[PDB]
Amino acid sequence: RGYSFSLTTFSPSGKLVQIEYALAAVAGGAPSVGIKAANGVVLATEKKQKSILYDERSVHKVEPITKHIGLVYSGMGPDYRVLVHRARKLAQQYYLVYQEPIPTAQLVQRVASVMQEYTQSGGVRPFGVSLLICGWNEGRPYLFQSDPSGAYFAWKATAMGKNYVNGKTFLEKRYNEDLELEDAIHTAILTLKESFEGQMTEDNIEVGICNEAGFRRLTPTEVKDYLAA
């Protein structure tokens, strides 16, 4: 009824419906999986393209906010770019003020605060993208998810996007805390494999790894090797 349309209106039952509707957008998004291994965090997502015509090198689902922090998204694509840019900017502001790379937890709190701001005003629409943010700070791997609501949770492993619920179950069954990243990247490709609905190919999937060295996107050749397994 009336509660559904407004974003500043709590429904009888105290649910802000437009945010719930916004989360539904993320669910419709392409599957994305994040596993936090002891030595690293692997972020991977499906980049399935409608046609061979699309040039894959042009746009990347997995992006680097800073040398040690990288993010993947499930949801509305235009929105991801806005958040990524604000994130890249928020980090540079930390560097200028404190001259130290931003701790990952700090960026996720800051990006989330931006998301909450969009939620408050009637004029704007909540962002429809959820971000998985992975980083290596203080010799420790970190993985975090920020939902359109503005809430950040820390996940040892999680999957967002289509078939998220099934993905999480597969991961809970296959997750070992002591896993090394080389094993973990394999676990992730398997998790995506569950819902791919097509032959996975190097182009169809995009994967990124965070370690002491810092966030990097595995190039297509490297993934082909991992897929060969």
Add this chain to the structure above:
Amino acid sequence: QPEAQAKVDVFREDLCTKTENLLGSYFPKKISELDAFLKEPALNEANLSNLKAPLDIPVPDPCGPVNCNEKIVVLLQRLKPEIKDVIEQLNLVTTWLQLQIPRIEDGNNFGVAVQEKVFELMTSLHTKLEGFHTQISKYFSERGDAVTKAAKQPHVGDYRQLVHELDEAEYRDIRLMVMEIRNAYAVLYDIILKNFEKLKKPRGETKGMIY
């Protein structure tokens, strides 16, 4: 004046307890009982030609008493108690919900709404069951008219066919009423059970108090 408040209170408590018993036990037991009746062979007969009962009316170039179709009558005797029972229980559920409806207020209406939507569905079942009762009553009158017409006019073959047809139709209607009653009992349970928290306490817990 609460001098007789005890009478009002007893009725209120009794309805609540009776309802719990119907919701907790009678409805589950009846669904099993009815499923057994559907399993029972009388309800399921493949060829209605078997159901057909002979008419003694003479065929033209003084009719003896022409009996009814016993098979149909026996099925009716099993079904008639059940129809009346569901109507009584439906009244009980309606009464219980109405006692649960709270003091009318401007807001926090969701809950009063849930109650109304549930009340509407129960009332819809009441109508269908009242209709089922009417269909049972009409069968005797129509069949009786059909046999008299057949007897008065032996020349008309169709009137004879109508008696057989009305019988065939009644068997099918009875089986459907039984199927519907089983369905009606279950839906009544599904609606009340799924929405029980709101039906029982529509307004919800008392809040902090802004004033």
Add this chain to the structure above:
Amino acid sequence: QPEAQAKVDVFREDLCTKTENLLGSYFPKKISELDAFLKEPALNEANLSNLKAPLDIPVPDPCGPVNCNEKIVVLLQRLKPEIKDVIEQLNLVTTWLQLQIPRIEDGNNFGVAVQEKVFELMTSLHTKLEGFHTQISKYFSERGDAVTKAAKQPHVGDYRQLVHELDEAEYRDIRLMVMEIRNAYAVLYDIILKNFEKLKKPRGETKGMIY
């Protein structure tokens, strides 16, 4: 006009006092009497066959006075005063709320709305009771039609069955009516009692005196 005012005031006072008496004392008392009546054995009979009454129609290979089902008649005689009593009470309560409805105004309609919602429920009951009153009459006419039909056409067995079926149905309907009559008295008590403050004073007595 002042002499006229006295006549109007007398009615206004009389309606208000009577309603409080009905709600305060008569309604609780009636709920108790009716629930007792439902428990009374005549109202609950396990075998409807006992209800069946003799048909003297001579079965064909001269009809003596056929008689009414006394058991149904005695129950009806108990039920009929109650059905009439409830309708009268509904009128008193409907009139009372109507006199309570305040001068029409463009706001603070809540309260006038509560009065309207209750009226809808009271009106619904009045409609349902009228249906009960009508049903009682139809039973006598319908059964009478069936017996004449049975007498006219002894050959048709179904007509005799109809007379028995009608009596059983009436017994079942009467049982529901008693339950519903008790429920109506109860629901009326709950709705009027719960929202009494708005019904008695729809607008409210506040005088901020902003103007």
Add this chain to the structure above:
Amino acid sequence: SYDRAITVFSPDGHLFQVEYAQEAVKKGSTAVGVRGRDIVVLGVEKKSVAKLQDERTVRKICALDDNVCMAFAGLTADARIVINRARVECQSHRLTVEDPVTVEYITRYIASLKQRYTQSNGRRPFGISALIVGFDFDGTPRLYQTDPSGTYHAWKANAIGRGAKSVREFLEKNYTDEAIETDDLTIKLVIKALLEVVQSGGKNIELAVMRRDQSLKILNPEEIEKYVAEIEKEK
């Protein structure tokens, strides 16, 4: 139809949302003020201890400044904003004119704040009515009341809040020059009146007196017990 916006005027020229805010005041706890010749007494009912709740935090009666005290009935939070804003003004007047605020100046200021909220949509009228008691420079006792609308009136005695109608009737009959003759008698009148509307006894009334130059004093629960006893004994 004409009740959804403060700005809209109903056919018949009634602004409904302002009237509805006045209804909110009625839901609030009762408060009574009596202007005695030398003492002004403000008394408010306390809803309940709740057992596990500290009572120091809940205070209906507050001092706007040394010479002005206010009691409120209505949404509690709004009162805290109005009380705070009045306190800033009392001090600001002292800064601007070097003189202590008269009781009426504070009443007019509080009223204007409320009217400002009623005037434009996009703000909700403060749902509070307040009794402001004070002694003026001449030393005349003054009692004023304000309503969500922004109307201020001076009342010799008044009750705001739930049951106000009943207490005000009691006060109309009970109030007399004779009753206000003794400072104790004045405290007794308010206690007696609140007793009429309070479901419990003295346990549920918080009462305070402001004397000609003395600061507001919230009477100790024991002092209240003594007064209720004298009243009960006399009954």
Add this chain to the structure above:
Amino acid sequence: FRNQYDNDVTVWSPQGRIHQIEYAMEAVKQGSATVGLKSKTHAVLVALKRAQSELAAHQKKILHVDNHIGISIAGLTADARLLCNFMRQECLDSRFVFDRPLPVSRLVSLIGSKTQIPTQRYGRRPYGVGLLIAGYDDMGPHIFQTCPSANYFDCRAMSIGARSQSARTYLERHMSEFMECNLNELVKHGLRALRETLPAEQDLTTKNVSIGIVGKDLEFTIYDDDDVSPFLEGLEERP
């Protein structure tokens, strides 16, 4: 239904008509009639004022913007007072900046621009006053009318207000005579034209008629209750 498309000035109707602007135009009809006519040397405004009650004074229908320009209002008085102030300030501004009486035509263009902005933007209602503006500038006597819609027209003569068709009719038939008319004749012709608007029982009186005259040698002057007596006395009786 078509209840929709009429709520705001920002909604175009399916057939190209902005209804609120039209509804605003209806406001001028509600007001008392006013007639404006011009001669080669003078421009005249005559108005039929209305009174709330016998005790109450008749309202002001003719207002002086400047020595060379004056207006007569038909419609909501409030909108008129606001527009008049804008016009007066625009005229005062020209004298301070350029030391020239503002050309009357230029002022009407400015009133049009201010008036149009409410029509296209959500928010302020379209002004619902209809204004007849009369002035003598170097180009000559000028009579202009402004609709609640910002459109403005230059007229040999015009009547705006209730029952103003009747006046326009008289003016059209006797129009040629006006150009060479003397001032007394021109006001007399106008008083007759507004008389047509009046109900048959009602008659022009010193109390309900206001005459404003501006000319090469005459600064805009509003002859009022006792000063309309010279112009009114010469008039005849109802046709």
Add this chain to the structure above:
Amino acid sequence: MFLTRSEYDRGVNTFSPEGRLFQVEYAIEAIKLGSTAIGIQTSEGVCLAVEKRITSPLMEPSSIEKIVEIDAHIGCAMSGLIADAKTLIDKARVETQNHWFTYNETMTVESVTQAVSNLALQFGEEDADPGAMSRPFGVALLFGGVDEKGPQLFHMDPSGTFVQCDARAIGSASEGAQSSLQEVYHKSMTLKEAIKSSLIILKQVMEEKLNATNIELATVQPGQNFHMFTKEELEEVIKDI
């Protein structure tokens, strides 16, 4: 046959088919909710009278203030919402004072009404300023004062229109009081006759019996400044009725 749809009434800034701007009209209706106030202008002076409408004996009569002094020369009797009146009386008080400061003279009653009227007209969202009430003001003020032109009474309405009135009644019983005023008013009446006549009309319109407490009466004769009859003076005049 009833067509009661309305649907153009809600929301100022909306012109009804027929161009009626109903919200403003409804505001004019509000003044009828207010207590009746009657003003008579006579050569001797202008007299203003109002009915207090005191709800409870405990409320102090002095506080109800339906007649107030804008300045010594001009006074105002207000009927309608009390609160919006307070703003309009304030604009008037500041404008009279601003005129003394800028021009060292006393504003005429008409200019002061024009000044308050200008504020009332702003309700239309005419200006971009945030601090302007969106709703039309709900008060009608009768402003009476002795100026250069002698005793004058101007009546202002929520629309913001102002007119001189020899006698006007604003308020609940204005219709009917006005009718009576029309019969009684003669230009030659002295203030003494007017005070008696106005109070006679008020006694008829007011529900309660007239008593010094229930009425407020003021006069601004040319030599004197705004004067409010005290209870003693009021008692003498009411006794004469």
Add this chain to the structure above:
Amino acid sequence: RRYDSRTTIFSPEGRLYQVEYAMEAIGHAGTCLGILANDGVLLAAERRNIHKLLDEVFFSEKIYKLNEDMACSVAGITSDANVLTNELRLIAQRYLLQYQEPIPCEQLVTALCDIKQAYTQFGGKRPFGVSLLYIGWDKHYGFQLYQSDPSGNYGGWKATCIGNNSAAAVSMLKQDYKEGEMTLKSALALAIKVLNKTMDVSKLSAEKVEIATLTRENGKTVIRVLKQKEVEQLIKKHEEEEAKAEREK
């Protein structure tokens, strides 16, 4: 019809429904409990989140340290909470800069509550949907526990629970809490007992609860989140104590 949208419209009957609707949200949230004891004040919360793949990187999910001398637990929309906690931390630091003394506990609560009232009064913003318990020691009133509501109305409570099954907890606390006799050790036990009843899980996981205690030691307040081993001992002690009473029965 609908007088429950926009947060600025009083309903006939004077109720602001949007605030009431907001209060409903706190009910869905995980239970948080605070008990005041003569020695110290404790906050214990139920970490509703129990998904196996979640990491306890933070000091606490629901307990936040507003200032050296005070702490808060939040129940309600998490995003709204993050905004309020940031604000509370700034409000406190501003008092210290201005008066160079720690913010008195009530004042921090009163100020946040004022931000919460404003959101209710002005038209565009939704009322904040969080209810939070503040625990702190102030020189003026010693150890204090305060509970806040979306309304902006705050209260001082010796013990209170906000969130799911709050009513059951308050009832249990009402009989169990002994005024003037509570010690942190006893209170931690009362907390485990009430939490056990309120939480649906038969056994408190000891990973399903977070308990934080504020005590003044050596003249400086210490807010410590009890580590899991410490809580596990408390759960075992309760399990044994209740079992012993059952064994006696």
Add this chain to the structure above:
Amino acid sequence: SGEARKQVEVFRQNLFQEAEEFLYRFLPQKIIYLNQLLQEDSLNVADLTSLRAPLDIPIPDPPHKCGFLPGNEKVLSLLALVKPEVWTLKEKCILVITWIQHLIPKIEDGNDFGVAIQEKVLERVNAVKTKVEAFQTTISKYFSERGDAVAKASKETHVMDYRALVHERDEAAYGELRAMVLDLRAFYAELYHIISSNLEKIVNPKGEEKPSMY
């Protein structure tokens, strides 16, 4: 034509004076008279057995047209008292509906609230009209129904349900008459209350013309 307006104006004025008089005289008097008819024991009979009226039809037993079977006299005398009242109310209700219909104002875009008060009052007057008209139909239905039962009962002497129907039909009319006299009394009362409470808006729906804003 002014003369045509005058002729309607004469009718309108007469209706207003009658309505005012009916409101201050006939309506209060009727409430009292009807309450008395209800108070009278005739409509307050404790046992319906006394109302049972002789049905002289010979029953069939083993070894001509029935003699005149008259209508239940008790019911008829009550019907004779009620029938004038049903018509007085219908006519007086009609007078009121015309008064309101005449008072309805020229259709306008807004300030149509007074019209609404008139519409809601009319809706009540219409509802009362349908109920009262039905009462008149019931009287005829009773005579036809009782008559048909008497005919059937004589035609088939054996069936005794038909005999019960005659007794029941008579019983119902006694019950109905009691309710009907109650309703007419209540209806005069409700009409007086709605009209008196809302008289100002009904008499002058749009009110005094708004002071010129134009």
Add this chain to the structure above:
Amino acid sequence: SGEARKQVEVFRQNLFQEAEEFLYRFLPQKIIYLNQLLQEDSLNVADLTSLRAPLDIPIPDPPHKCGFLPGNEKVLSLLALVKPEVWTLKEKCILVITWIQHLIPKIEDGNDFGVAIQEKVLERVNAVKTKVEAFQTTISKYFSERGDAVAKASKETHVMDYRALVHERDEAAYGELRAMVLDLRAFYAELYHIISSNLEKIVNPKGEEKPSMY
């Protein structure tokens, strides 16, 4: 009480399996079976005159009860084929209606889109039910109408319209049986199409549990 939920859940699990089975197998199979009947020559008779059945009623002329008049055999054989078919569709629809009603979720303020997909489907199933129930009624009416017309013809041998009516009634029934089978075929098809396309929301209206905002 848990025991009660278990039995009802069993009924639900049975309903789900039966409903799924019906959609997967019975509905497609029936569409083929009913289309076969339409193609069958019996339902595609070129000349309706062939369907005419003899009415041996003596035709009157200027100088006994008619011999038994049998019902058109062709129509009865066809009706016998149609009457079982009508019943199965009504039963299979009732199974679907119950399944959807069982699946309707707990009433909640938000996420009511799924409830709507179900409600829209319920509307189609309700509409189909009324149409099919009507078909069952028509079968009964044909026998009664043909019979009454035959009776009238015998009583009044002279009127020949009565004779034509009987022949006409039979031709009408034949046309309607063809339409009814065509409708049953279509109804089976429509239910498969609406349920198949909208199955995910119909089975799972609310959807999976969302991430916690609390």
